[PDB]
């Protein structure tokens, strides 16, 4: 029912299965969620409606 | 050492000893560093330059 993903820097953070990158995006802080741009997982590009998987890591990146 | 905090989502992220809230804002994402402002420890305001404890619940405030 969970999944748990981490952080570039090494934190986990847990969101319920089914989620996407864009939900980490925000899982993270409403700032990262609003300036998304496109997400990495585990180094490569993702569609934004990627399902996440525990272990991966998530790499978001913002418009800045 | 290191200190430990929460999210206000409730996840938890490690930083250095000494750590303030800033380090924490860019510990969890560039663009929140980049766009913070303010900062709230468990709930109540603090100066930016707070540093935190281990069990707080940090809430970076962004360019609104």
Chains 1, 2 share one sequence.
Do not use: Q, W
Not at 1 to 27: C, H, M, N, Q, W
């Amino acid at each position: 029912e969970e999944v748990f993903v981490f952080t570039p820097k090494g934190d986990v953070i847990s969101l319920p299965i089914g989620s996407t990158v864009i939900d980490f995006a925000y899982a993270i802080h409403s700032a990262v969620g609003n300036r998304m741009i496109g997400a990495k997982v585990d180094g490569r590009i993702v569609p934004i409606d990627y399902k996440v998987k525990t272990g991966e890591i998530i790499d978001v990146l913002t418009t800045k």
